[PDB]
Design an enzyme around this catalytic site. Structure first.
Site, PDB file in Angstrom:
ATOM      1  CB  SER A   1      -0.923  -0.042   1.207  1.00  0.00           C
ATOM      2  OG  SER A   1      -2.023   0.780   1.040  1.00  0.00           O
TER       3      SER A   1
ATOM      4  CG  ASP B   1      -5.485  -3.551  -4.176  1.00  0.00           C
ATOM      5  OD1 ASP B   1      -6.133  -2.663  -3.675  1.00  0.00           O
ATOM      6  OD2 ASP B   1      -4.376  -3.814  -3.726  1.00  0.00           O
TER       7      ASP B   1
ATOM      8  CG  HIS C   1      -5.329  -2.640  -0.557  1.00  0.00           C
ATOM      9  ND1 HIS C   1      -4.289  -2.540  -1.437  1.00  0.00           N
ATOM     10  CD2 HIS C   1      -4.984  -1.893   0.515  1.00  0.00           C
ATOM     11  CE1 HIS C   1      -3.359  -1.751  -0.929  1.00  0.00           C
ATOM     12  NE2 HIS C   1      -3.757  -1.339   0.256  1.00  0.00           N
TER      13      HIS C   1
END
Ligand SMILES: *[C@@H]1O[C@H](CO)[C@@H](O)[C@H](O)[C@H]1NC(C)=O
Ligand SMILES: *[C@@H]1O[C@H](CO)[C@@H](O)[C@H](O)[C@H]1NC(C)=O
Ligand SMILES: CCCCCCCCCCCC(=O)O
Ligand SMILES: O=Cc1ccc([N+](=O)[O-])cc1
EC number: 3.1.1.3
Lengths: 269, 269
Positions: free
Chosen positions: A146, A201, A258
């Site tokens: 991320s 994602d 994600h």
């Protein structure tokens, strides 16, 4: 389809990225074994792996992460943590570019990522340099999930070419800048970027292209579902700046996707 | 170590139990399809499965869950949610027994689960009875995770013997009462209770046996790790009231193990 060795590497650095959230760590003495809660990083725990340096809310962007030494795999790993709550981080994500000719001429990067890094670069470069000196044989790897993935990509581009290769493994990373910055990332020698994505994602689809962002090539794209285990056949190498048909496809994206790269990531049971 | 058929049921009701947390239904009108976020209940979504009645913070225990119709598997399913914050619920958990003769003689049960069930019993019994009428050949199943498992177990013990079998599938359920209750749940007719545990999950280890609590027999013990997929070979049937060498071992317990029954449960990606 990807090789067994590369798969193993992907799995391992997904775990070093997960460990940045789920480490029972920080305020943790250097030389301490790296361990995680909730079976988040068992391949790291099998390795003779120890913290070199921990940072928490450092500099301007409140950066969090760790530098690790791994005598089994012969690595020096700098792992950056993503946000403590990804949902709000995505919501408040600002799309401003700032120039970064310092990294490559004509290059512009996401302003918050580059300034968070920039503000801790000098400390962490020295910490990495120290470890490189101590273990000239060991491979330098930066990784993150991320936002953590972003920071690792930026720091890599910034710190390469000073003598030692830097590989980067990123999981569910956002775009980090303009085309040109993307192009640099696709070709820069002194290390390889493995830019890993999962299914639909949401995070790698931000910042959007429309705001002047591109993705580096190639893309490693996991097509197995959320909470489904990944095999080598589920991973597809996708070539081309801003290529479509991996994560970058025209459908509704998902936050849960994600959080599943090889295992649970970006959250701790 | 268990049959495929039994492994398949265990997996299906772990997913109905997971749906009580995930997959939005907050006021979802009766007859809508059952779906979940975060791939929490794909086997359920794959069946022709619809809501009959949704409840939320119902009665004195703020009981929450749903009743579903499954035409593919020919089931009427009453699924109880566990607590919205399990770590807390674990910390706030009182160990007081209360007499429950109405269900059995010499039997004491946990005061909160018992009371919570009793406060919703009439309304829910009526809703099950209605479906049983409309679908006399469908199997009635009560299921739940964590607190939801305790409740389903209590409700099953309480509504059996009325002419339709009720099977109970519980996941990570705490102890629900005293040795005489354990015995009653071990031998009671009009359905089977399938009490499934995972590894060193803490919740089936509470309330302690040293507060007068006992477990019904048998136990179906999942030995595969947290975040590990489960096969029929990873589940062991352990026989005997308060048997040891399944979940009931003197080792140190764990909360994340509670959130992995076949897949992710008691939390939503
Ligand atoms: C740390 O790991 C090393 C090598 O993997 C092992 O020998 C040692 O027991 C572990 N240390 C602690 C303090 O648990
Ligand atoms: C509900 O599921 C059934 C079959 O299981 C399907 O035929 C129907 O379209 C679904 N309804 C919606 C709104 O998706
Ligand atoms: C049968 C459904 C019971 C679920 C509702 C329990 C309330 C959960 C709220 C969180 C408070 C706690 O930590 O126990
Ligand atoms: O188990 C394997 C394995 C393969 C490659 C790497 N690596 O290059 O760090 C690590 C682990």
């Amino acid at each position: 389809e990807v090789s067994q060795d590369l798969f193993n590497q992907f799995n391992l650095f997904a775990q070093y990225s997960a460990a940045a959230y789920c480490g029972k760590n920080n305020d943790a003495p250097a030389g301490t074994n790296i361990t995680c809660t909730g079976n988040a990083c068992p391949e790291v725990e099998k390795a003779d792996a120890t913290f070199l340096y921990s940072f928490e809310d450092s500099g301007v962007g409140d950066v969090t992460g760790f530098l690790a030494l791994d005598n089994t795999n012969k690595l020096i790993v700098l792992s950056f943590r993503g946000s403590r709550s990804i949902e709000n981080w995505i919501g408040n994500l600002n799309f401003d570019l700032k120039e970064i000719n310092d990294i490559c001429s004509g290059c512009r990067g996401h302003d918050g990522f580059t300034s968070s890094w920039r503000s801790v670069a000098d400390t962490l470069r020295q910490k990495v340099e120290d470890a490189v000196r101590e273990h000239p044989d060991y491979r330098v790897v930066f990784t993150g999930h991320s936002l953590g993935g972003a920071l690792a990509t930026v720091a890599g581009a910034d710190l390469r070419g000073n003598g030692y290769d830097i590989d980067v493994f990123s999981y569910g990373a956002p775009r980090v800048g303009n085309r040109a910055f993307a192009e640099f990332l696709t070709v820069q020698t002194g290390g390889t970027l493995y830019r890993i994505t999962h299914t639909n994602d949401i995070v790698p689809r931000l910042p959007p292209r429309e705001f002047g962002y591109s993705h580096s090539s190639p893309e490693y794209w996991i097509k197995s579902g959320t909470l489904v285990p990944v095999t080598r056949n589920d991973i597809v190498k996708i070539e081309g700046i801003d290529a479509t048909g991996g994560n970058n496809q025209p459908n509704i994206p998902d936050i849960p996707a994600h959080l599943w790269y090889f295992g649970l990531i970006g959250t701790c049971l």
